[PDB]
Amino acid sequence: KKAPTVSVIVAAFNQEKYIGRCIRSLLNQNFPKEDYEIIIINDGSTDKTKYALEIFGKEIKVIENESNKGLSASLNLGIRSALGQFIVRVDADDYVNSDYVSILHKFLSYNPNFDAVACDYYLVDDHEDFLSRKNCMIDPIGCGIMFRIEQLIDIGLYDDGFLSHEDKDLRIRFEKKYSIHRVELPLYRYRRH
């Protein structure tokens, strides 16, 4: 097989309500199938999440924890298993536009000087109505940032407890040496809860 260049990570604990829309949007990318992979961690769900993942068969890669290990352990498992050099986390209750992966990857591929990229997003409700558009630098979120794997490793990604810390604190650690470049397109969809 050809190694994918982009690995998408989704940590999922009891996400039966939204995980279907999430995965469908990731499978509906205009990026070539051979160039990315979708890695879902079922972190000990007790609802229909396991069945939801079975729906999609071999189109996704599933890591199943027998019991709930938590976000940091789950993200560690998913990223360690990832084959791509670009890594992005998508929340299980979020979803993305069909050009999301291709455009973020294009900006990284053509601009080695850009360490990581994120794009703007819409706040959406449970019926996928766009409530408002957010600038990702004014209102940063913890998901949807495409990173270069070795830069994450450089700042201590795999250290015990690192990925359990608050999003704002992880961002500070990344921005000590690196910078996130904003792509001025609203291609991510962030669920209001």
XYZ file of N, CA and C in Angstrom:
579
model
N 0.817 -1.211 0.000
C 0.000 0.000 0.000
C 0.855 1.268 0.000
N 0.291 2.347 -0.536
C 0.902 3.663 -0.428
C 0.638 4.241 0.959
N 1.667 4.823 1.556
C 1.491 5.451 2.858
C 0.652 6.713 2.704
N -0.358 6.930 3.541
C -1.085 8.197 3.466
C -0.198 9.323 3.963
N -0.469 10.529 3.473
C 0.279 11.679 3.964
C -0.417 12.381 5.122
N -1.745 12.306 5.207
C -2.531 12.959 6.255
C -3.208 11.889 7.102
N -3.073 11.991 8.423
C -3.795 11.114 9.340
C -4.758 11.965 10.153
N -6.048 11.622 10.100
C -7.093 12.295 10.869
C -7.413 11.442 12.094
N -7.369 12.050 13.284
C -7.569 11.349 14.558
C -8.884 11.802 15.176
N -9.729 10.842 15.559
C -10.996 11.122 16.233
C -11.079 10.239 17.471
N -11.035 10.851 18.647
C -11.267 10.133 19.900
C -12.757 10.167 20.229
N -13.346 9.002 20.482
C -14.799 8.887 20.564
C -15.183 8.089 21.793
N -15.878 8.741 22.728
C -16.471 8.088 23.891
C -17.960 8.413 23.910
N -18.797 7.410 23.656
C -20.254 7.565 23.693
C -20.726 8.700 22.783
N -20.361 8.602 21.509
C -20.686 9.627 20.521
C -21.704 9.140 19.492
N -22.653 8.297 19.915
C -23.587 7.709 18.954
C -24.386 8.766 18.189
N -24.641 9.927 18.803
C -25.539 10.903 18.187
C -24.895 11.600 16.992
N -23.595 11.862 17.058
C -22.946 12.716 16.073
C -21.863 12.041 15.251
N -21.398 10.856 15.644
C -20.215 10.291 15.002
C -20.503 9.952 13.542
N -21.764 9.694 13.193
C -22.076 9.371 11.807
C -21.856 10.547 10.872
N -22.345 11.731 11.259
C -22.102 12.935 10.468
C -20.612 13.244 10.390
N -19.897 13.053 11.496
C -18.456 13.288 11.496
C -17.755 12.410 10.461
N -17.975 11.098 10.529
C -17.248 10.197 9.643
C -17.654 10.407 8.186
N -18.949 10.604 7.921
C -19.391 10.850 6.550
C -18.691 12.062 5.952
N -18.506 13.122 6.745
C -17.847 14.304 6.187
C -16.371 14.028 5.911
N -15.736 13.192 6.739
C -14.343 12.817 6.510
C -14.197 11.877 5.314
N -15.178 11.016 5.080
C -15.125 10.153 3.908
C -15.471 10.902 2.626
N -16.139 12.050 2.743
C -16.579 12.839 1.600
C -15.540 13.891 1.183
N -14.268 13.648 1.447
C -13.230 14.615 1.104
C -12.845 14.513 -0.367
N -12.564 15.664 -0.989
C -12.096 15.631 -2.367
C -10.611 15.273 -2.478
N -9.961 14.990 -1.367
C -8.579 14.525 -1.320
C -8.515 13.050 -1.743
N -7.463 12.618 -2.445
C -7.404 11.210 -2.882
C -7.417 10.251 -1.694
N -8.188 9.163 -1.835
C -8.369 8.226 -0.724
C -7.038 7.660 -0.254
N -6.121 7.409 -1.187
C -4.842 6.815 -0.829
C -3.955 7.770 -0.050
N -4.290 9.058 -0.014
C -3.417 10.049 0.593
C -3.821 10.421 2.013
N -4.894 9.848 2.551
C -5.217 10.117 3.943
C -5.857 8.888 4.567
N -5.867 8.867 5.896
C -6.525 7.806 6.649
C -7.333 8.436 7.771
N -8.397 7.745 8.174
C -9.246 8.158 9.292
C -9.065 7.147 10.411
N -8.601 7.623 11.562
C -8.306 6.779 12.719
C -9.256 7.182 13.839
N -10.184 6.291 14.189
C -11.137 6.535 15.267
C -10.730 5.678 16.453
N -10.622 6.294 17.625
C -10.454 5.541 18.862
C -11.817 5.471 19.543
N -12.378 4.270 19.613
C -13.552 3.994 20.442
C -13.053 3.738 21.856
N -13.162 4.755 22.716
C -12.545 4.715 24.044
C -13.522 4.144 25.073
N -13.842 2.866 24.895
C -14.696 2.180 25.846
C -16.139 2.641 25.850
N -16.688 3.005 24.691
C -18.082 3.436 24.627
C -19.019 2.318 25.064
N -20.120 2.713 25.699
C -21.171 1.783 26.076
C -22.453 1.986 25.278
N -22.501 2.986 24.399
C -23.686 3.197 23.578
C -23.507 2.518 22.222
N -24.143 3.043 21.177
C -24.081 2.431 19.857
C -22.868 2.890 19.049
N -21.875 3.504 19.702
C -20.717 4.008 18.964
C -19.992 2.882 18.230
N -19.825 1.729 18.881
C -19.129 0.610 18.245
C -19.847 0.168 16.974
N -21.175 0.136 17.011
C -21.931 -0.238 15.818
C -21.824 0.834 14.745
N -21.907 2.106 15.140
C -21.713 3.194 14.183
C -20.404 3.034 13.425
N -19.323 2.674 14.121
C -18.054 2.508 13.416
C -18.093 1.295 12.493
N -18.775 0.217 12.905
C -18.861 -0.969 12.056
C -19.577 -0.663 10.749
N -20.502 0.304 10.767
C -21.234 0.692 9.560
C -20.271 0.979 8.416
N -19.163 1.651 8.719
C -18.244 2.129 7.695
C -17.155 1.130 7.324
N -17.098 -0.026 7.987
C -16.263 -1.116 7.499
C -14.797 -0.737 7.406
N -14.183 -1.071 6.269
C -12.757 -0.854 6.053
C -12.428 0.559 5.586
N -13.414 1.453 5.496
C -13.131 2.817 5.068
C -12.438 3.618 6.160
N -12.469 3.126 7.403
C -11.825 3.757 8.542
C -10.993 2.715 9.276
N -10.047 3.202 10.070
C -9.259 2.381 10.976
C -9.769 2.628 12.387
N -10.094 1.556 13.111
C -10.692 1.677 14.436
C -9.750 1.071 15.468
N -9.457 1.834 16.516
C -8.803 1.325 17.718
C -9.860 1.260 18.810
N -10.031 0.091 19.414
C -11.056 -0.109 20.435
C -10.405 -0.351 21.789
N -10.727 0.496 22.761
C -10.350 0.245 24.146
C -11.479 -0.518 24.827
N -11.119 -1.558 25.585
C -12.128 -2.347 26.287
C -12.846 -1.510 27.337
N -12.112 -0.639 28.023
C -12.684 0.278 28.997
C -12.206 1.689 28.682
N -12.826 2.669 29.326
C -12.538 4.065 29.018
C -11.193 4.459 29.623
N -10.228 4.795 28.761
C -8.883 5.167 29.189
C -8.652 6.673 29.248
N -9.522 7.473 28.643
C -9.397 8.913 28.697
C -8.834 9.489 27.408
N -8.938 10.812 27.298
C -8.592 11.472 26.042
C -7.109 11.318 25.721
N -6.241 11.542 26.713
C -4.803 11.539 26.449
C -4.332 10.158 26.009
N -4.751 9.112 26.727
C -4.377 7.762 26.321
C -4.913 7.442 24.930
N -6.143 7.868 24.636
C -6.732 7.563 23.335
C -5.996 8.284 22.211
N -5.672 9.567 22.408
C -4.966 10.305 21.363
C -3.563 9.753 21.174
N -2.903 9.359 22.274
C -1.597 8.708 22.167
C -1.679 7.462 21.289
N -2.673 6.608 21.530
C -2.815 5.406 20.714
C -3.017 5.759 19.246
N -3.919 6.699 18.965
C -4.211 7.026 17.578
C -3.014 7.618 16.858
N -2.312 8.552 17.507
C -1.201 9.217 16.829
C -0.026 8.263 16.657
N 0.262 7.437 17.672
C 1.313 6.431 17.511
C 1.035 5.504 16.333
N -0.240 5.231 16.044
C -0.578 4.327 14.951
C -0.599 5.027 13.602
N -0.517 6.351 13.586
C -0.723 7.111 12.358
C 0.441 6.913 11.390
N 0.121 6.806 10.100
C 1.131 6.613 9.068
C 1.504 7.902 8.347
N 0.728 8.972 8.513
C 0.999 10.184 7.781
C 1.958 11.101 8.505
N 2.532 12.029 7.753
C 3.407 13.029 8.340
C 2.650 14.275 8.783
N 1.399 14.429 8.361
C 0.538 15.513 8.810
C -0.581 14.919 9.653
N -0.829 15.523 10.810
C -1.771 15.012 11.798
C -2.799 16.094 12.091
N -4.070 15.705 12.154
C -5.131 16.630 12.536
C -6.158 15.885 13.383
N -6.586 16.510 14.467
C -7.643 15.950 15.297
C -8.975 16.591 14.911
N -9.996 15.763 14.717
C -11.358 16.235 14.508
C -12.206 15.701 15.657
N -13.000 16.569 16.273
C -13.904 16.118 17.330
C -15.046 15.287 16.746
N -15.505 14.301 17.527
C -16.510 13.362 17.031
C -17.875 14.013 16.817
N -18.168 15.123 17.500
C -19.410 15.855 17.287
C -19.260 17.018 16.316
N -18.086 17.192 15.722
C -17.847 18.176 14.677
C -17.885 17.488 13.313
N -17.727 18.280 12.252
C -17.563 17.720 10.914
C -16.951 18.803 10.037
N -16.600 18.430 8.799
C -15.808 19.310 7.948
C -16.379 19.374 6.536
N -16.090 20.493 5.867
C -16.373 20.664 4.445
C -15.521 19.699 3.610
N -16.012 19.379 2.401
C -15.352 18.395 1.542
C -13.962 18.831 1.068
N -13.631 20.122 1.135
C -12.313 20.617 0.729
C -11.372 20.842 1.913
N -11.778 20.431 3.108
C -11.025 20.751 4.314
C -9.621 20.141 4.292
N -9.523 18.822 4.121
C -8.210 18.175 4.187
C -7.299 18.661 3.056
N -7.825 18.702 1.836
C -7.010 19.066 0.681
C -6.438 20.470 0.829
N -7.256 21.418 1.293
C -6.793 22.801 1.334
C -5.772 22.997 2.450
N -6.036 22.463 3.649
C -5.024 22.570 4.698
C -3.723 21.904 4.271
N -3.810 20.723 3.650
C -2.586 20.046 3.228
C -1.855 20.860 2.167
N -2.603 21.454 1.238
C -1.980 22.266 0.200
C -1.175 23.407 0.809
N -1.732 24.085 1.818
C -1.015 25.213 2.408
C 0.248 24.759 3.131
N 0.210 23.598 3.781
C 1.431 23.076 4.386
C 2.420 22.594 3.335
N 1.929 21.888 2.318
C 2.819 21.308 1.319
C 3.567 22.390 0.549
N 2.882 23.477 0.205
C 3.516 24.530 -0.582
C 4.307 25.526 0.253
N 4.153 25.524 1.570
C 4.764 26.539 2.432
C 5.458 25.833 3.581
N 6.687 25.358 3.360
C 7.438 24.706 4.450
C 7.656 25.616 5.636
N 7.611 26.930 5.416
C 7.744 27.900 6.492
C 6.525 27.937 7.415
N 5.368 27.418 6.989
C 4.202 27.346 7.875
C 4.310 26.092 8.731
N 4.367 26.267 10.055
C 4.529 25.109 10.930
C 3.253 24.283 10.995
N 2.125 24.936 11.252
C 0.827 24.286 11.339
C -0.186 25.220 10.703
N -1.332 24.669 10.290
C -2.394 25.485 9.716
C -3.712 25.147 10.393
N -4.548 26.169 10.552
C -5.942 25.982 10.939
C -6.784 26.882 10.052
N -8.084 26.620 9.994
C -8.947 27.465 9.189
C -10.086 27.988 10.044
N -10.870 28.888 9.459
C -12.026 29.401 10.157
C -13.090 28.314 10.249
N -14.108 28.566 11.067
C -15.127 27.546 11.259
C -16.479 28.198 11.490
N -17.520 27.411 11.250
C -18.869 27.793 11.621
C -19.263 27.076 12.904
N -19.940 27.804 13.776
C -20.674 27.192 14.870
C -21.975 26.621 14.318
N -22.247 25.347 14.620
C -23.436 24.673 14.104
C -24.225 24.056 15.251
N -25.536 23.892 15.040
C -26.400 23.270 16.031
C -26.599 21.795 15.677
N -27.487 21.114 16.411
C -27.697 19.688 16.190
C -28.336 19.387 14.845
N -28.879 20.395 14.161
C -29.470 20.217 12.841
C -28.592 20.797 11.736
N -27.297 20.975 12.013
C -26.300 21.435 11.043
C -26.653 22.796 10.439
N -27.384 23.624 11.187
C -27.560 25.021 10.800
C -26.303 25.804 11.170
N -25.789 26.607 10.233
C -24.643 27.477 10.502
C -25.114 28.664 11.333
N -24.692 28.723 12.598
C -25.152 29.794 13.477
C -24.319 31.065 13.316
N -23.006 30.932 13.135
C -22.135 32.093 12.989
C -20.767 31.610 12.537
N -20.010 32.516 11.912
C -18.659 32.218 11.454
C -17.663 32.777 12.462
N -16.658 31.976 12.806
C -15.642 32.355 13.772
C -14.273 32.387 13.109
N -13.504 33.416 13.437
C -12.094 33.503 13.074
C -11.285 32.625 14.028
N -10.496 31.692 13.483
C -9.826 30.715 14.339
C -8.694 31.309 15.174
N -8.213 32.512 14.861
C -7.236 33.146 15.734
C -7.904 33.954 16.833
N -9.066 34.543 16.545
C -9.795 35.295 17.561
C -10.466 34.345 18.545
N -11.029 33.247 18.039
C -11.730 32.251 18.854
C -11.134 30.878 18.583
N -9.934 30.612 19.090
C -9.286 29.327 18.805
C -10.034 28.171 19.448
N -9.984 27.015 18.787
C -10.512 25.780 19.353
C -9.379 24.761 19.426
N -9.652 23.650 20.101
C -8.637 22.644 20.332
C -8.472 21.624 19.232
N -9.375 21.590 18.256
C -9.343 20.621 17.167
C -9.225 21.337 15.827
N -8.955 20.559 14.782
C -8.976 21.101 13.435
C -7.689 21.754 12.983
N -6.612 21.622 13.755
C -5.306 22.184 13.417
C -4.471 21.063 12.813
N -3.966 21.274 11.602
C -3.125 20.277 10.943
C -1.666 20.569 11.268
N -0.979 19.587 11.848
C 0.379 19.732 12.361
C 1.347 18.840 11.592
N 2.636 19.179 11.666
C 3.695 18.286 11.201
C 4.118 17.408 12.378
N 4.055 16.080 12.199
C 4.231 15.142 13.320
C 5.542 15.387 14.078
N 6.661 15.617 13.372
C 7.923 15.712 14.114
C 7.979 16.966 14.986
N 7.250 18.023 14.613
C 7.200 19.215 15.463
C 6.415 18.942 16.738
N 5.325 18.177 16.639
C 4.587 17.774 17.834
C 5.461 16.946 18.763
N 6.165 15.957 18.207
C 7.072 15.132 19.000
C 8.119 16.006 19.679
N 8.623 17.006 18.946
C 9.643 17.915 19.466
C 9.187 18.630 20.736
N 7.897 18.983 20.842
C 7.463 19.733 22.022
C 7.014 18.820 23.164
N 7.092 17.506 22.993
C 6.801 16.565 24.051
C 5.478 15.847 23.924
N 4.923 15.758 22.707
C 3.605 15.174 22.451
C 3.329 13.905 23.249
N 4.282 12.981 23.258
C 4.079 11.657 23.828
C 4.402 11.579 25.318
N 4.857 12.673 25.929
C 5.179 12.625 27.356
C 3.934 12.266 28.165
N 4.141 11.542 29.262
C 3.025 11.044 30.061
C 2.210 12.202 30.626
N 0.946 12.290 30.216
C 0.051 13.329 30.674
C -0.059 14.526 29.748
N 0.864 14.669 28.792
C 0.881 15.855 27.938
C -0.479 16.097 27.282
N -1.043 15.076 26.628
C -2.277 15.267 25.871
C -3.529 15.277 26.745
N -3.384 15.264 28.073
C -4.512 15.464 28.975
C -4.709 16.925 29.349
N -3.799 17.801 28.947
C -3.824 19.181 29.401
C -4.804 20.007 28.571
N -5.155 21.176 29.099
C -6.149 22.032 28.467
C -5.654 22.534 27.115
N -6.601 22.721 26.185
C -6.246 23.140 24.828
C -5.433 24.425 24.834
N -5.836 25.401 25.657
C -5.116 26.670 25.681
C -3.678 26.472 26.138
N -3.445 25.514 27.036
C -2.090 25.262 27.509
C -1.255 24.507 26.471
N -1.858 23.559 25.752
C -1.129 22.900 24.673
C -0.754 23.895 23.587
N -1.655 24.839 23.300
C -1.360 25.854 22.294
C -0.171 26.710 22.716
N -0.111 27.092 23.997
C 1.029 27.868 24.482
C 2.327 27.092 24.288
N 2.310 25.788 24.590
C 3.515 24.978 24.433
C 3.948 24.901 22.971
N 2.996 24.752 22.056
C 3.362 24.706 20.644
C 3.919 26.044 20.184
N 3.323 27.140 20.646
C 3.694 28.457 20.152
C 4.959 28.994 20.793
N 5.564 28.253 21.726
C 6.873 28.659 22.226
C 7.886 28.724 21.090
N 7.871 27.732 20.194
C 8.806 27.688 19.079
C 8.148 27.744 17.708
N 6.869 27.390 17.585
C 6.225 27.261 16.285
C 5.020 28.195 16.207
N 4.436 28.317 15.017
C 3.283 29.194 14.860
C 2.224 28.527 13.999
N 0.979 28.824 14.318
C -0.162 28.320 13.563
C -0.550 29.370 12.536
N -0.648 28.958 11.276
C -1.029 29.857 10.199
C -2.524 29.735 9.939
N -3.225 30.864 9.953
C -4.655 30.854 9.669
C -4.934 30.848 8.163
N -5.765 29.898 7.727
C -6.306 29.856 6.370
C -7.697 30.475 6.408
N -7.912 31.518 5.610
C -9.103 32.353 5.776
C -10.309 31.787 5.021
N -10.616 30.515 5.266
C -11.786 29.836 4.712
C -12.526 29.107 5.828
N -13.870 29.199 5.883
C -14.626 28.487 6.961
C -15.000 27.053 6.588
N -14.018 26.164 6.708
C -14.155 24.796 6.229
C -14.398 23.785 7.343
N -14.346 24.205 8.599
C -14.587 23.332 9.738
C -15.947 23.691 10.324
N -16.589 22.717 10.965
C -17.891 22.910 11.602
C -17.796 22.439 13.046
N -17.975 23.365 13.975
C -17.796 23.134 15.404
C -19.172 23.125 16.055
N -19.508 22.031 16.741
C -20.844 21.882 17.300
C -20.979 22.684 18.591
N -22.039 23.491 18.671
C -22.388 24.204 19.893
C -23.032 23.235 20.876
N -22.481 23.155 22.085
C -23.086 22.350 23.147
C -23.283 23.177 24.412
